[PDB]
Design a binder for this molecule. Structure first.
Ligand code: HEM
Length: 199
């Protein structure tokens, strides 16, 4: 692939689809109880990247980055559902450097692709003002926002060597998402969606 952002996508599409499949297999919308499990999982992931969204160096390369964070929104969704802020039971990742750029790609891309989840949350009467605030589209549009973000990512002009570390970071962010999902939904370590399932 000819660009950093495209290489990130290429190298992480298989694991991304494993995440999509696993999230859907545990039935996040089957009940309020399961949706709360989903919100807990989302809380941990978005907390884990909070310090990256606020990173001073990255905010100088990517204007207004700190404001793209969704942790506050997920935490308000929890409140809406009658829950207090959720705290992970285990130590949370606090990644840095090139690898942290990969975590940032993973988190920011998750908003890009949150339309399907937002659609299904709406069936439960949860919308951008109550219960599904964290899934609502960027006010400028999901795509407009992502393409801009994508420009800034490519413009970091990471050397190929630093790109490798960033891509490894993205692999690790996806893997952590599934570790959290499993602990949260009561699955075994390394549990996956039924084999052969397609997003
Ligand atoms: C069942 C849940 C999920 C579904 C159905 C889903 C679906 C999608 C879709 C359709 C896109 C393409 C959107 C577009 O191009 O307009 C996308 C992109 C992406 N998603 Fe997901 N996703 C889910 C969960 C996640 C999660 C939990 C993460 C991160 C932890 C994530 C990370 C990403 C990233 C980083 C991209 C950008 C790919 C790119 O580089 O173009 N997704 N997703």
């Amino acid at each position: 692939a000819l660009t950093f952002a495209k290489r990130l996508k290429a190298d992480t599409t298989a694991v991304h689809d494993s995440v999509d499949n696993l999230v859907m297999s545990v039935q996040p919308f089957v009940s309020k109880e399961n949706y709360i499990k989903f919100l807990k999982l989302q809380s941990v992931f978005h907390k884990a990247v909070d310090h990256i969204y606020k990173d001073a160096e990255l905010n100088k390369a990517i204007p207004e980055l700190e404001y793209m964070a969704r942790y506050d929104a997920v935490t308000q969704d929890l409140k809406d559902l009658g829950e207090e802020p959720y705290k992970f039971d285990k130590e949370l990742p606090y990644e840095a450097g090139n690898k942290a750029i990969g975590w940032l790609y993973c988190a920011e891309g998750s908003n890009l692709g949150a339309a399907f989840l937002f659609k299904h949350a709406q069936k439960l009467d949860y919308n951008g003002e109550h219960g599904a605030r964290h899934l609502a589209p960027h006010p400028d549009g999901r795509g407009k926002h992502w393409r801009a973000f994508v420009e800034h990512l490519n413009a970091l002009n990471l050397t190929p060597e630093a790109e490798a570390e960033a891509i490894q970071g993205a692999r690790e962010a996806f893997a952590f998402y599934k570790v959290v999902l499993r602990e949260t939904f009561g699955l075994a370590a390394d549990a996956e969606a039924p084999e052969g399932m397609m997003p």
